Amino acid sequence: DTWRYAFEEAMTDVQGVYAQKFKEEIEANSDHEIQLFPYGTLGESADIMEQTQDGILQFVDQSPGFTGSLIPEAQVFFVPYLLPTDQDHLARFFKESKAINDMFKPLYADQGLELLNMFPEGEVAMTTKTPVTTCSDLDEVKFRVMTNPLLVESYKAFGATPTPLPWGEVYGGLQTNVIQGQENPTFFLYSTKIYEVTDYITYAGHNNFTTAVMANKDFYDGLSAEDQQLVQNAALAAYDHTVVYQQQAADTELAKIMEAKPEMQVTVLTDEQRSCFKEAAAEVEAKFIEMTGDSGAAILKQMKADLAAT
Ligand SMILES: CC1=N[C@H](C(=O)O)CCN1
């Protein structure tokens, strides 16, 4: 059978680990067959989302970092320090969240997409060519960022000069010094060898990388009750498998960056040093309320209640 599936990373990366477990589970329990499409085929994240909405692709992985333009209240995932750093507590959140698994679903549906899961990918880290010790060290650093308004507002509040750019241009831009800064989890910034074109890694603990897996809603609604269930089963099985794997990654990948490039300067900021960043976190939150109205306000409240209950 057909059923095409496209994601934003390599096969060996985290979104690939998810895809491959999803593929296993579908194929072990039916006659259906999943066809995988990693980054490097079909093009950027914006491209594959269009391809999923046009109906060429059936399943797509698109991170809220790109969907913030489409669904405005997906900007919640970029309110600094909202998401906990405790990876065990974080995994229980996305699984049992009334906000993620109930309140977000009709909003994605408004754009013709059937939301399956959201999952974490790990604590994020700044890579720059100048030292970052406080917020004023970011002053006039051209910092690449995913394409959504609030994430852009975050690095303005940090003191940097934010630049929205699709991933395909990030390595080259850094190499030719058109940009001086970038942010991603540790597994990915090792995987993409981005340490070759940056000098400093900084753990501010401001965010965890979140991503989402969805299906073309028309396609999904066309399926039988058994097929729909089969998909839901495969998504839940892929989630459980991915969270275990991505925990191991964050806990081991930094050792490999230092192995391949021993000169690399890796700073993890103390709570004392993180103070100016957490001060910016409150005014970014205030900005989020202004942009998304009372619609996204109910999402923030529930998200906080889900974190507490878990
Ligand atoms: C951590 C990650 N970064 C990519 C990016 O910065 O656009 C998206 C695929 N996954």
Q: What are phi and psi of 238, to 5 degrees?
A: -70, -40
Question: Residue ranges for the binding site for L-ectoine?
Answer: 9, 144, 184, 188, 209
Rounded to an integer, what distance in angstroms lies between the CA atom of residue 300 and that of residue 310?
Answer: 16
Write out the two tokens for 258. Answer: 């230092």
The answer to whether 13 and 191 have CB atoms below 8 angstroms apart is yes
Q: Which residues are paired to 60 by β-bridges?
A: 6, 214
Q: Which residue stretches of the chain are H helix?
A: 14-28, 45-54, 64-67, 87-96, 98, 105-109, 149-158, 170-175, 186-191, 217-222, 225-250, 253-260, 271-308
Please choose, from the candidates 150, 147, 126, 144, the residue with its C-alpha nearest in 3D space to the C-alpha of residue 76. Answer: 150
Question: Which atom, in ligand 1's list, is nearest to the CA of 182?
Answer: 6
Pull the structure tokens for residue 42.
Answer: 């079909």
CATH for 1-310 (3.40.190.290, 3.40.50.150, 3.40.109.10, 3.40.190.170) = 3.40.190.170
Euclidean distance between CA atoms 14 and 10, whole angstroms: 8
Annotated resolution, angstroms = 2.9
Going by C-alpha positions, the residue among 51, 56, 55, 75 that lies closest to residue 64 is 75
Tell me if 160 sits within 8 A of 141, measured CB to CB: yes
184 Cα: distance to centroid of ligand 1 (angstroms): 7
Q: Are 40 and 260 in contact (CB under 8 A)?
A: no
Query: Which residues does 73 contact at the CB level (< 8 Å), separation at least 6?
Result: 107, 292, 295, 296, 299
Spatial separation of the C-alpha atoms in residues 181 and 131, rounded to whole Å: 11
If one residue of 13, 146, 187 were mutated to test the ligand 1 pocket, choosing by the most ligand atoms within 8 A of its CB, it would be: 146
Ligand 1 in reach of 185 Cβ (< 6 A): yes
Between strands 200-203 and 181-185, the pairing is unpaired
DSSP 101: I
Segments making up each domain of the chain, as ranges: 1-310
With a 6 Å cutoff on the Cβ, whether 114 touches ligand 1 is: no
Helix (H, G, I), strand (E, B) or coil at 209: strand
Convert 140-158 to b/e letters by CB count within 10 Å (16 or more is b).
Answer: ebbbbbbbbbbbbbbbbbb
CB–CB of 130/137 below 8 Å? yes
Q: Whose CA is nearest to atom 3 of ligand 1?
A: 184
